[PDB]
Design a binder for these strands. Sequence first.
DNA 1: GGTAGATCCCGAC
DNA 2: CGGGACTAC
Length: 252
Amino acid sequence: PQLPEVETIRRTLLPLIVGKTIEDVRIFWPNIIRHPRDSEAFAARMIGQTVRGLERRGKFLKFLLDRDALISHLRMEGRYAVASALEPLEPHTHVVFCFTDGSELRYRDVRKFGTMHVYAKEEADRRPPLAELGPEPLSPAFSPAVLAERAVKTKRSVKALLLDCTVVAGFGNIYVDESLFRAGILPGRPAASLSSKEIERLHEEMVATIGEAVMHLYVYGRQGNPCKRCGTPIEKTVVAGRGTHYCPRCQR
DNA sequence: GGTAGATCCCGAC
DNA sequence: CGGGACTAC
Ligand SMILES: [Zn+2]
C-alpha cells in the first residue's frame, strides 16, 4: 500500500480496535519483529495494554497503546484485518493480536517484507524506523524551500531525492513518477539541475498528486502506450534502482 | 558525511 | 526480477 492507502487503513482500522485490550500476541514469522529483537519480549510487553489511538507517519502506522507504541510498515503487500478468534486465519498470516473480546487484529503479508517495532510511546519518534523520517508531503513542513535545500546539496537524481525518506515521508515510486510527469521533469535529471521554477512546480505537483489520492495514471505502468497529453509512447527505464516511467516529450 | 550496496521474500516471468 | 527502508566504499 502507498501513503494514501495507509491513511485509509489508519482511518478505517481505528474504530475497529480502539478501546480493546490485548490478551495475547501470536507470531508465526519472527523476522517481522524488529524491536525488541526477541519476538517473545515483543509479545509479552504488549499483553494487558489497551489500544488508545492510531496515527500515520509517512507509510508507517503508529498504534498507540497504554505505555507503548507499535510502529508498523506494510511494505508492498502487507495488510491488516479485524476478525473473530473462532474463524480460521487467512493464508500468509504472520502476526496476530488477540483482544479480550474474542476479536483479533491480524497482519498478513505474502512477501513477509513488513516490519514491526515496539517502544515506550515517548521513545518511538527518536528510534528506528521513525527517527530521521522527513516531513509529511501534505504538511507546511514540506515546502519548496525545504525541497530546494536538499536538491542543491546532492549529486543524486531528482527521482532518488524524492524516494529518500529523510527528504519527504513515504512518497512512493508511483507518485514520484506521476509527480515528475505532471511537473514536466525527467526522473534522471540531477536534483541540483532543477531551477527554482522547477522546484516550485515539482512541489506543487507532489502535493496535488498525493493529496488527490488521499482524498487515472499518466505514466506509471504505461510503458509502450501513448502519452495521455501528447501521444508519444511512454518509456520505462531504471532510475535510482527502480522501474521508472516517463514521457520523453512532456518531460525535460 | 554522502552514496551505493547488501538485505529480505516469493509470485509472476 | 522487483522492491522500502543497516553496512561499508
Ligand atoms: Zn507526453
